[PDB]
Design a protein around this nucleic acid. Structure first.
Ligand code: MG
Ligand code: ZN
Ligand code: ZN
Lengths: 243, 1364, 347
DNA sequence: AAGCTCAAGTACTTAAGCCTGGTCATTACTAGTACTGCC
DNA sequence: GGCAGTACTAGTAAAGTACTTGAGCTT
RNA sequence: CAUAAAGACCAGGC
């Protein structure tokens, strides 16, 4: 109900009261008077939950007209097996409040339900009905991506997904400034070294977690090695210096 | 191992290259496709690097483990593992050395400034081309155009010869060893200041900043030339096939094979040992070979067949010429990671997450292999690698025993602020979606219609436990930006709790509490049979809370039971119920502030869980569903519609009849509809609060859940007005709403405003990390390291009133900041020696505002610490409410707190478009309440007309009572008359100011005599006649009506004394020379004595404005990137008196006369610029002149250091405070220093005047010489404000400024200085891969554990160490 | 062929066909793009072409872009709008006389709209020949004025030409804001063929034309007598000769049963004609991927109840009972292709 | 004649996350060589 | 049987910042 | 346990 005040979409509540009162507006017409034509067991119970509330002379009645007539006054609206509504010239609140005081069961849309969990007499009768919802498709984005041990590239030591092994999440720069924004010093350190890059971290780590102990403290990363050899072959040089 | 202090970058020497490298690579010999063994002594060798297999030899003589250490006799090769082939190095002996193109194509040429050659010209003349072996000698003074001549004096033209000055770079060393450097270098400091010809001092002041870099502790210039080429590691470039007959290799395999085949050719073809004047053909091929290893694209790229792309060089992997810099910071792929849909976990808490159960089968498996051997699932480690790697139905039990106490890293990809990556315990949940906590959903700018997040796995027990006490979301409940919590009960939780403490209305609606007192029992007892109280109005008849719900359940009471049970559900799991009373609807975010300040954080966790359960659980117990009938139409709607529709017919008949014009009907048609929504608005909000109070759509917008005062009006009454996509308003209002029959026209009109919000976020949802990036690149080295500094230098004065949003606001800028000294403004409160102030202290600094003008406060921008900022000057904001701790990257959390609110800002275009406003003024100041008149920056004086006439505009005319509170805010233009002065008491409903909204009189400030200056009949003045006065007086002609020759003549009523000298204005050294505009009224004679306040001339008309304030993210890009605004204001270069020059409809002028020059200091003012300056008292330098922004470069030059650090942190908040986001001043100031970190000193103390060096080093140089002892030196400066795209371009580090596309000019700057890069920043520590300094990496974080067994255990060796 | 294949696969203008829905198919062919070749505006600009112009009334639906990286760049085409002959869009208007509305239509150019005044579709009309009240609000070319019946020359066909087929199926579009009517038009763009297809309980008049007009519902070529009906084929015995149960000029109809589309879904065609039913030229023969008989049936109708349940429906979450997975009411068919291209080997 | 600053002219800039999809082609032209047909 | 032609197959053809620089104006 | 390249372009989610 809180998707209504911000996202201004009151027409789904129009469709909710509408699908509630489908038994009493214009599916009122084709639902029974045409027909329960295939099912001979609905033509005893549904024939009395219909005329108790709704009595508009525009909306045709069971007790006057037989099965073969609507199967002549509603051949014109057989394509509208439920109610028909155009886009901007359709239902009106003077017509909706006139056709919902009719519609079985409730009056003016709202009815006292009961809780499925507590049970008791439910305060403030609510807007219910039959909303026509829609399921979205399942693209391959919704498929679960599970990667622990796959292949690696040639010129870099990054993982790679594809046909058999799934794709791995990249660790982007804003993710670097989050753990960098934190006081965590070892998580971001092993995130760029032991996870992705180092050939000496992913092997020794996998050899120490299977023993039951901790993994060895991270030495040289592969970015330090590759970038350092990119520096050394030029005129400049980078050298790690101790304490 | 040990903590590494710092790294040092320097140029490579063969005495150093041959130290780590062994052997000698002679041929391009790789590993063949058949055998992996080395072929010959080339790039892949066993004697140089190492063998391939475990213990076998190359020939095949000894392969058994009997001979493991001793080498063979015929071919001695020691054998180890293949890992030593990676680390060991080799070096390629190049016969001729070559250049490094970073030192060549770069605009600051390292061999052109220091060694005086052309910086670009001769480099594109000598190196690749055919000009041959200048060093020294005695032929040609001219030193530029190399062939033929060329150093020091003989002989130019015809033929000459066919002087080093060599092609390539085998002898640029020999230029760097002699050009004669001694005639180029002691003499530098004399030619700058001594010789009057400034061509010699503007050419030689550029060439010391690279000259003194080698004189200092850095290296020598003779190592910029690449002599020996170090090899690439052997296993770093594998040669395996891809699939079948295709290959995937690096682009270095085609380039190291060429340099070696172009090396021995110069050695032995070419067996000479010749003079160097002969050979050309080899270094044109070898230099061509090494340039593809240097750079491809700066002169000529290196391409392959059917490939119009350059070969991927070693620099192109870093800078990304092909666009792979957008791929390097796109992210490195995590091997232990996943992705799925997100959903909501209500019963989930802030400690835990619910992730799917199939993802844990894959991502958590290395922790499973160490668990399978203890149980009966798997036997060994090898057979377990083929069962748990797949879908297995036995591992479900043994997986959960590892994940008892192992939280993970949750990750949403818009990782803007700190809380973008959070830590939670995994709960194994069926399905495919991860569960997200609802309080967390305020930190994640998201919804639940398709958003998908990631996850990571902590590996070591070191990094595991910091995901529980430092990374977990409920530990850090407060924002980095301000002291307000981001995580907050948002919509569904506050619905049942908001409805819970309510009272229905039939007659009476007060609030009641009876648990406790006794009077309201008898008072509210007898009402049950009366009309005052019922079964939903004012009743409670019971002692306590317990049986009130017993009586309420049996249909006798309805209200004050939820107020009775809310007072005991939440404080039962938590003590201190004295603070646990204020839930409210606007105090829903304030409870997580004061409950954290009074109580602890362990109160806050379960305190959020109880409010979580009783909030989300009872919302279904209320069941506040919105229907169509809940939207109650007011009765006053159709009456105001009927009155508004009946007036356009009358007004239309007025336009048809012709008695009125179009202008006075067109403003009436919009007037009758512009005030209709106000009259129908002030008819549903007062209808449902008196009749029904239990209305769903009223309570879901009256509360804090999701509601606005404009989105409810579109459904309920009438949506008022919609504008065009340009911005101009539509003349036809719209009247149908979402409830009634809404036609196609008004829906078509609403799309014009519906396209801006969603088309705004169209290209703003492809990309989300550059407004972060360009602001974290500048302030990355900001780390908390405080050692009892307590600095006083550069003290900042804070104005009690801010600079101004529109014309005159009233706001304060201090929050959580330390004080500078002892200030006693209040009567009860007192700030002592420096203490971190609270949120209550800004109301004390805002309360007594009529006494304070400068809040004494230590600032971030002025501190002694060079790399970091101390704990005092920064403040409190770390993650939580107490003081900052040591080791925090306060530069990235500051900038990312600026990148996150920029998403909701309006983005039209990066450089200013326009807006629309109207300027109006009234000469009717009537004070409402009583009190006194407070006046600031005014010089009141009584004239000869008997009127208290002011001499200043921008006078603060506010009603200040005996308590000092702002009640009014009025504007006083120039030339006004006050009824009462400053300090005199007024009464309610009394006029205290009156002027004319037609005339701005030219009113003097000093007494003396009036002397006619530059007024000649026929040139500047002409006898005319006014239209209102009727007196024929001397009237000055306009600027366009003047004759030829009077364009430079400016008329003046020059005020002199009785002695004929100039009368200076009191306060400044400004002569009183007021100019007469064209078409002025001069009713004054010559030589007659006047008094201070007499009217000289009048301004008959007033105009100006209509185009003004920008707002939004374009102003964010305008202020952080210091650029040119759309509306420049010509700021006054000199501080002094100001007086208008002209008043003509075409152009307006403005002239300031400091000491000697009056007339050439003219400032042209068009009609678009709204005049905010007056004709009186002196203005400051850097003061605003028009209705527009200022240039940050010139106000840096004029006013001082208390201007740009307070204008750039205040005006950016004028954007974010409009939308509602409150950002503290602490998180803007750390990048203001980084734009100010370089400057230019004027007095040479250690270096020369034009250096452009850093200022944190210059602060120590002025600190130790002036403060302590030893001959104090006035080493003053002139500042330099830059943009963040340039201040981060030239940094101290070389990888900090390598986040641009200009990695050529930075690496040479850190290369030639020998600069020791002390890695203080954290940005510069992830690319290098080392350990983070801010966490456990700082040197204070060194300790070890001790229990009582290991406390009595080392007591035995120290008794054992005692001898007998 | 080197220039026409480059546009067919590597172009900005040409993208993959969205075939998760016949409505997604029909909104894909009738699509506008602001971005084409390099001779026009770029992705980085567009803030004068995304905004709709007041002449576009009944000619393009201004809210029919997808919700994502591009808003206002697509803006697909409205229902009755049609490129007539030479690029000029001409939407129909009912030619109305003095007081009698004539049933004929005429295609009016955009520059010809400014020369005549056109009435509206929200006016009450009895059948085709009478006029209810002499003052009715009308629009000439964007301005608002009150005209009489003797001044009205043209009239709108219906209230349907202002919207597209993604918005003409939206029932209460007058009640929804356009900001979520854009996504409400995009929910039908990302639909999926469900098993138990259920037509909406609110009809518009466009659910039956998408299946017939597009390549969704099989239409017979010539009417005859049905002799046999199968799932994979529908044989039609059209009596081209004297009437006998001996067979005749058979037109076999292959119904595409289970193949892969672009959006990893399936296109289904279930027959409906029983044994012994004489068909007409224009009669339906089989269903579509979501069609019930001839109408469009994307989703289903379930019992809805507006209530904050307990926490779970926080922002945009949907809650549903255990019964939705006990029956295959939303169980769709997802088809994934595992393609691998053949090459050669060194050995 | 040296020179000093100033303004227009010029080149260059970096384009607010991550995520999967599918696909699509990795080059078509020139030169040498080998095979086949004809004299 | 020898020479020439040709086909096949393996290398191979928006809107800004800074920064430069040319020119106009003074000792 | 090893293989599914790299890159371009387009579509899509927010
Ligand atoms: Mg979403
Ligand atoms: Zn050997
Ligand atoms: Zn300090």
């Amino acid at each position: 109900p809180l998707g209504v005040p911000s996202r201004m979409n009151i027409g789904q509540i129009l469709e909710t009261h509408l699908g509630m009162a489908a038994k009493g507006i214009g599916d009122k017409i084709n639902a029974m008077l045409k027909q329960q034509q295939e099912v001979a067991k609905l033509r005893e119970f549904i024939q009395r939950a219909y005329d108790l509330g709704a009595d508009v002379r525009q909306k045709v009645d069971l007790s006057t007209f037989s099965d073969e007539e609507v199967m002549r006054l509603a051949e014109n609206l057989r394509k509208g097996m439920p109610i028909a509504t155009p886009v901007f010239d359709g239902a009106k609140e003077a017509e909706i409040k006139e056709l919902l005081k009719l519609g079985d069961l409730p009056t003016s849309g709202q009815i006292r339900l009961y809780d499925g969990r507590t049970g008791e007499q439910f305060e403030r009768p609510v807007t219910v009905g039959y909303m026509y919802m829609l399921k979205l498709n399942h693209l391959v984005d919704d498929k679960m991506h599970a990667r622990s041990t796959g292949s690696y590239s040639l010129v870099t030591q990054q993982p790679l997904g594809g046909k058999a092994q799934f794709g791995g999440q990249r660790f982007g720069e804003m993710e670097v400034w989050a753990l960098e924004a934190y006081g965590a010093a070892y998580t971001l350190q092993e995130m760029l070294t032991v996870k992705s890059d180092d050939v000496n971290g992913r092997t020794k780590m996998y050899k120490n977690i299977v023993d039951g102990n901790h993994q060895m403290e991270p030495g040289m990363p592969e970015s330090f090695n590759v970038l350092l050899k990119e520096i050394r072959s030029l005129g400049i040089n980078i050298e790690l210096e101790d304490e | 191992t040990e903590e590494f202090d710092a790294i040092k970058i320097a140029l490579a020497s063969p005495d150093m290259i041959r130290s780590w490298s062994f052997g000698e690579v002679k041929k391009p010999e790789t590993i063949n496709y058949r055998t992996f063994k080395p072929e010959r002594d080339g790039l892949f060798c066993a004697r140089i690097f190492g063998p391939v297999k475990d213990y076998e030899c190359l020939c095949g003589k000894y392969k058994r483990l009997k001979h493991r250490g001793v080498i063979c006799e015929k071919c001695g090769v020691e054998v180890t593992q293949t890992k030593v082939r990676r680390e060991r190095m080799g070096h390629i002996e190049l016969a001729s050395p070559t250049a490094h193109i970073w030192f060549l194509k770069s605009l600051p040429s390292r061999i052109g400034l220091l060694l005086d050659m052309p910086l670009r010209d001769i480099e594109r003349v000598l190196y690749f081309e055919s000009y041959v072996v200048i060093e020294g000698g005695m032929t040609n003074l001219e030193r530029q155009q190399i062939l033929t001549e060329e150093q020091y004096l003989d002989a130019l033209e015809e033929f000459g010869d066919e002087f080093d000055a060599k092609m390539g770079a085998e002898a640029i060393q020999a230029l760097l060893k002699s050009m004669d450097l001694e005639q180029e270098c002691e003499q530098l400091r004399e030619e700058l200041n001594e010789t009057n010809s400034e061509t010699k001092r503007k050419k030689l002041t550029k060439r010391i900043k690279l000259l003194e870099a080698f004189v200092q502790s850095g290296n020598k210039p003779e190592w910029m030339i690449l002599t020996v080429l170090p090899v690439l590691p052997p296993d770093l470039r594998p040669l395996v096939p891809l699939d079948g007959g295709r290959f995937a290799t690096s682009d270095l395999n085609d380039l190291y094979r060429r340099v070696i085949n172009r090396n021995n050719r110069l050695k032995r073809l070419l067996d000479l040992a010749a003079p160097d004047i002969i050979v050309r053909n080899e270094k044109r091929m070898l230099q061509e070979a090494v340039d593809a290893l240097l750079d491809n694209g700066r002169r000529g790229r290196a391409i392959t067949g059917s490939n119009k792309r350059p070969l991927k060089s070693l620099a192109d992997m870093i800078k990304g010429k092909q666009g792979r810099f957008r791929q390097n910071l796109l992210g490195k792929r995590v091997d232990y990671s996943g992705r799925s849909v997100i959903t909501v976990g209500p019963y989930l808490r802030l400690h835990q997450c619910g992730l799917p159960k199939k993802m844990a089968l894959e991502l958590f498996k290395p922790f499973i292999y160490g668990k399978l051997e203890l149980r009966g699932l798997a036997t060994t480690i090898k057979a377990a690698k083929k069962m748990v790697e797949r879908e297995e139905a036995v591992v479900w039990d043994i997986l959960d025993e590892v994940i008892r106490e192992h939280p993970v890293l949750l990750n949403r990809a818009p990782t803007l602020h700190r809380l973008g990556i959070q830590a939670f315990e995994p709960v194994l949940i069926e399905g495919k979606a991860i569960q997200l906590h609802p309080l967390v959903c305020a930190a994640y700018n998201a919804d639940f219609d398709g958003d998908q997040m990631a996850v990571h796995v902590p590996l070591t027990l070191e990094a595991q436990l910091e995901a529980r006490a430092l990374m977990m979301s409920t530990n850090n409940i407060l924002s980095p930006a301000n002291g307000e919590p981001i995580i907050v009960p948002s919509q569904d939780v506050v619905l049942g709790l908001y409805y819970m403490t309510r009272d229905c209305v039939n007659a009476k609606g007060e609030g009641m509490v009876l648990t406790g007192p006794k009077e309201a029992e008898r008072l509210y007892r007898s009402g049950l049979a009366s009309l005052h109280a019922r079964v939903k109005v004012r009743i409670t008849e019971y002692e306590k809370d317990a049986n009130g719900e017993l009586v309420a359940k049996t249909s006798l009471k309805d209200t004050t039971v939820g107020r009775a049970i809310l007072w005991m559900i939440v404080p039962k799991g938590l003590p201190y119920s004295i603070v646990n009373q204020a839930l409210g609807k606007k105090a829903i975010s304030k409870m997580l502030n004061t409950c954290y300040r009074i109580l602890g954080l362990k109160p806050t966790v379960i305190f959020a869980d109880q409010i979580m359960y009783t909030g989300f659980a009872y919302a279904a117990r209320s069941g506040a569903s919105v229907g169509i009938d809940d939207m109650v139409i007011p009765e006053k709607k159709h009456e105001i519609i009927s009155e508004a529709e009946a007036e356009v017919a009358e007004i239309q008949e007025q336009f048809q009849s012709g008695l009125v014009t179009a202008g006075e009907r067109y403003n009436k048609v919009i007037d009758i509809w512009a005030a209709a929504n106000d009259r129908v608005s002030k008819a549903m909000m007062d209808n449902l609060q008196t009749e029904v109070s239990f209305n769903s759509i009223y309570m879901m917008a009256d509360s804090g859940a999701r509601g606005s005062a404009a989105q409810i009006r579109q459904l309920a009454g009438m949506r008022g007005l919609m504008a065009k996509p340009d911005g101009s308003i539509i003349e036809t209002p719209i009247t149908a709403n979402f409830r009634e029959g809404l036609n196609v026209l008004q829906y078509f009109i609403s799309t014009h405003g519906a396209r801006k919000g969603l088309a705004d976020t169209a290209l703003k949802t492809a990309n989300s990390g550059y407004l972060t990036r360009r602001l974290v690149d500048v302030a990355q080295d900001l780390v908390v390291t405080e050692d009892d500094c307590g600095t006083h230098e550069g003290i900042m004065m804070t104005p009690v009133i801010e600079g101004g949003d529109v014309k005159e606001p009233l706001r304060d800028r201090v929050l959580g900041r330390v004080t500078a000294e002892d200030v006693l403004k209040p009567g009860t409160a007192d700030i002592l020696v420096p203490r971190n102030t609270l949120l209550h202290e800004q109301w004390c600094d805002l309360l007594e505002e009529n006494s304070v003008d400068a809040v004494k406060v230590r600032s971030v921008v002025s501190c002694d610490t060079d790399f970091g900022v101390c704990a005092h000057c920064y403040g409190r904001d770390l993650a939580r409410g107490h003081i900052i701790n040591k080791g925090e990257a306060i530069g990235v959390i500051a900038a990312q707190s600026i990148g996150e609110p920029g998403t909701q800002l309006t983005m039209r275009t990066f450089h200013i478009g326009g807006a629309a406003s109207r300027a109006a003024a009234e000469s009717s100041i009537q004070v409402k309440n009583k009190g006194s008149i407070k006046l600031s920056n005014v010089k009141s004086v009584v004239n000869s007309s008997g009127k208290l006439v002011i001499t200043s505009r921008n006078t603060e005319l506010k009603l200040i009572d005996e308590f000092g509170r702002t009640k009014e805010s009025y504007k006083v233009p120039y030339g006004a008359v006050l009824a009462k002065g400053d300090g005199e008491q007024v009464a309610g409903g009394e006029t205290v100011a009156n002027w004319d909204p037609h005339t701005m009189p030219v009113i003097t400030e000093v007494s003396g005599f009036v002397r006619f200056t530059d007024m000649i009949d026929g040139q500047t003045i002409t006898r005319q006649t006014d239209e209102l006065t009727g007196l024929s007086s001397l009237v000055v002609l306009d600027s366009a009506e003047r004759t030829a020759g009077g364009k430079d003549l400016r008329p003046a009523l020059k005020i002199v004394d009785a002695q004929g000298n100039d009368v200076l204005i009191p306060g400044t050294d400004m002569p009183a020379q007021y100019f007469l505009p064209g078409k002025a009224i001069v009713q004054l004679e010559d030589g007659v004595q006047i008094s201070s306040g007499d009217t000289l001339a009048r301004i008959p008309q007033e105009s100006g404005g209509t185009k003004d304030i920008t707002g939004g993210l374009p102003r964010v890009a305008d202020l952080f990137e210091a650029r040119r605004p759309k509306e420049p204001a010509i700021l006054a270069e000199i501080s002094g008196i100001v007086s208008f020059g002209k008043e003509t409809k075409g152009k307006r002028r403005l002239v300031i006369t400091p000491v000697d020059g009056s007339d050439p200091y003219e400032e042209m003012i068009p009609k678009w610029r709204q005049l905010n300056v007056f004709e009186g008292e002196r203005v400051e330098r850097g003061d605003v002149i028009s209705d527009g922004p200022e240039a940050p470069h010139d106000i840096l030059r004029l006013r001082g250091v208390h201007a740009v650090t307070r204008y750039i942190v205040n005006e950016v908040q004028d954007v974010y405070r409009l939308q509602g986001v409150k950002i503290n001043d602490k998180h803007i100031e750390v990048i203001v220093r980084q734009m100010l970190r370089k400057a230019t000193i004027v007095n040479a103390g250690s270096s020369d005047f034009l250096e452009g060096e850093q200022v944190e080093y210059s602060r120590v140089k002025i600190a130790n010489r002036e403060l302590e002892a030893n001959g104090k030196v006035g080493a003053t400066y002139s500042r330099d404000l830059l943009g963040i795209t340039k201040a981060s371009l030239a940094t101290e580090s070389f990888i900090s400024a390598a986040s641009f596309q200009e990695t050529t000019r930075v690496l040479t700057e850190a290369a030639v200085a020998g600069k020791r890069d002390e890695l203080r920043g954290l940005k510069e520590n992830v690319i290098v891969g080392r350990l983070i300094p801010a966490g456990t990496g700082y040197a204070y974080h060194q300790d070890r554990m001790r229990r009582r067994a290991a406390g009595e255990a080392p007591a035995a060796p120290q008794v054992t160490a005692e001898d007998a | 062929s080197a220039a026409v294949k480059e546009f067919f696969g590597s172009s900005q203008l040409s993208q993959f066909m969205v075939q998760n829905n016949p409505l997604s198919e029909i909104t894909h062919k009738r699509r506008i793009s602001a971005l084409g070749p390099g001779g026009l505006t770029r992705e980085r600009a567009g803030f004068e072409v995304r905004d709709v112009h007041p002449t576009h009334y009944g000619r393009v639906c201004p809210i029919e872009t997808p919700e994502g990286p591009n808003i206002g760049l697509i803006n697909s085409l409205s229902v009755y709008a049609q490129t007539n002959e030479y690029g000029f869009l001409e939407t129909p208007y009912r030619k109305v006389t003095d007081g009698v509305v004539t049933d004929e239509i005429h295609y009016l150019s955009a520059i010809e709209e400014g020369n005549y005044v056109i009435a509206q579709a929200n006016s009450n009309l009895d059948e085709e020949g009478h006029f209810v009240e002499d003052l009715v609000t009308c629009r000439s070319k964007g301005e608002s004025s009150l005209f009489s019946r003797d001044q009205v020359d043209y009239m709108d066909v219906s209230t349907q030409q202002v919207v597209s087929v993604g918005a003409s199926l939206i029932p209460f579009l007058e009640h929804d804001d356009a900001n979520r009517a854009l996504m409400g038009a995009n929910m039908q763009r990302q639909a999926v063929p469900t098993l138990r297809a259920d037509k909406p309980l609110v009809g518009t008049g466009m659910e039956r034309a998408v299946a017939v007009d597009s390549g969704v519902t099989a239409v017979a070529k010539r009417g005859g007598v049905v002799q046999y009906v199968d799932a994979s084929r529908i044989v039609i015995k059209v009596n081209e000769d004297e009437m006998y149960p001996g067979e005749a000029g058979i037109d076999i109809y292959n119904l595409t049963k289970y193949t892969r589309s672009n959006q990893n879904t399936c296109i289904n065609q279930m027959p409906c004609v029983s044994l012994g039913e004489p068909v007409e030229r224009g009669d339906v023969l089989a269903d579509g991927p979501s069609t019930d008989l001839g109408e469009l049936a994307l989703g289903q109708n379930m019992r809805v109840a507006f209530m904050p349940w307990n926490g779970y429906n926080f922002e945009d979450s949907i809650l549903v009972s255990e019964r939705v997975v006990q029956e295959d009411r939303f169980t769709t068919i997802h088809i994934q292709e595992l393609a691998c291209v053949s090459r050669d080997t060194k050995l």
